[model samples]
Target: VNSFSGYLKLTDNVYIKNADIVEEAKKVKPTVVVNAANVYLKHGGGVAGALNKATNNAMQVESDDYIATNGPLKVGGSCVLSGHNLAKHCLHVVGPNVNKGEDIQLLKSAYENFNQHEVLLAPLLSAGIFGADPIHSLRVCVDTVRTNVYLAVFDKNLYDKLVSSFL
Candidate 1:
């Protein structure tokens, strides 16, 4: 596979790119930037941590306060928060953890919940620590988006896979 960079237009409203979500979120200033978040909304690592770091850890502080006030965010749900230096808002979604259980429906549900936004930037939901296969998660991501979406795919191999899949 060829090493890929930049973006591939998937449709009139969808795109796939080898991107750092935190940086790209600034460029797009989308309605929201989606975080592959946890049930507790903790931004400890992965995409969540990157975004939290970019926003000066305000995201983590707010997330912790939210969880403390309202309890843990449920799986397949979105918790919208300020985007700080990124978009207008940040969306936290807890996708299915395949290491714990294989539940594609829950993953699908995570994809379905962000339709409230007109534009969004999102990483591959559930693909890293959550353990969903990249290909499968990409399919779910592509199928469920109802608004303009810029998908920030971080891995070089996954980026090439996404480009080839369109071919």
Candidate 2:
């Protein structure tokens, strides 16, 4: 499918877009970008990997140091760290693992817990290996963010799903 630019306006201050988050981060230059992170906060793949690449791998080093000091995140847990080259800070949150039958409340709280900032660039939380349905991820993100949020989604089909059903 050909790429395009359009956003779902979820609220007065919240929006969702299907775009490369790394590129969006560079363009928007928001205060922080949410990392759809793991319990160990490893930047091995998915959004974490892309963001790590954006920061020239400094974000991963900071994540290592953070976990070394603060220990592993429980599902729904979050921590703020340097955003390196992407933004002012990176907010890492562990979302529920649906494949493990983890409670969806973990995913809910993950969204609520991290809305404590101003300008934020977020991704579809837990919609990757954690196994959240993209639509559910979209709705949860739309429901929780309290400040200016731009959900920079990467999957074209996921974006298409949002537009098809919700637009």
Best by lDDT: 1
The CA lDDT at 18 in model 2 is 81
Q: How does each model score on lDDT?
A: 0.81, 0.81
Model 1's number of clashes is 0
Error of 1 at 125 (Å): 0.6
Highest TM-score scorer: 1
TM accuracy, model 2 = 0.90
Q: Write the per-residue lDDT of candidate 1 for residues 1-167, one digit (tens) a residue.
A: 12223668787667888878877887767767899998988788989988999989888888889889899877888888888888788888889887877576898889887678877788889987778788888878778887777788888887888778763
In model 1, the Cα lDDT at residue 48 comes to 90
lDDT of 2 by residue, 32-89 (tens): 8889888898888988898998888898888899889989999998998887877788
Clashing pairs in 2: none
Score every model by TM-score: 0.90, 0.90
Model 2: residues >4 Å from true position, as ranges?
A: 1-6
TM-score of 1: 0.90
